[PDB]
Amino acid sequence: MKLERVTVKNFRSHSDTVVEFKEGINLIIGQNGSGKSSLLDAILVGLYWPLRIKDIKKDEFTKVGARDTYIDLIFEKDGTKYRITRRFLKGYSSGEIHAMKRLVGNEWKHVTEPSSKAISAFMEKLIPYNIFLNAIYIRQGQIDAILES
């Protein structure tokens, strides 16, 4: 798996951010309270939502003054370029966006049914949640967790 770009809107301290990750070592220096972990958790949210992390709840990650939360992720896995779009709204599904696509030329095409259910199942087969959590994304405060048994 390789991340290309992350677009987040109204996620914690993020109102509208766009990050383009490259190959090699990508550092993001920031001070306490700046947005570092916020960006990473959005990436997690947009990939496996719904999650099983008690310390990450929908009604809490929507930027204070905002109403909708937007996360757009474009990544590459085994030659195929995928893209997942999540749009959170506290009111209706009509506006809610949950679609994972496959790039065909210059056009993105539904990899499957646009819903948390279908996208979850497809992501689980593309890259299992557990493997992402103790092998890929090491959250803040969890560096030596791997030593625990």
Partner: protein, 145 residues
Amino acid sequence: ALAREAALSKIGELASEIFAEFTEGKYSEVVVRAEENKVRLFVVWEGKERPLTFLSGGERIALGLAFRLAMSLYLAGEISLLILDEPTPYLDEERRRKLITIMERYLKKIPQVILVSHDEELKDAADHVIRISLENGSSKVEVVS
């Protein structure tokens, strides 16, 4: 059961190398054992295996990073990505420097790695550097290196 013994054993040889380096040989080897699905870790000190409680707090963070690197190195073709959030806590000035060294020596053998930190010193061992600041209630990303 034995295929996991092969994986683990391999990751341990990798962790041992990085950790010996990280600690200037204070700990010469990291051992990984398996008595019925129960994985135990030991650090070789002055010739013998010592349980993990033998370690100091900073050393335990260094061993943890060693297993994360080793882990990502062993899956570098299947996963190719490692994301570390704040890798420097508990590490003293010297171990922080040493870490940098461990970075463009091992961390550069993984296709893609996303680091996050408040330590501007890691600004060296990076390929691309991005700053994030909190301007007027919202985060602002400025691209640098």
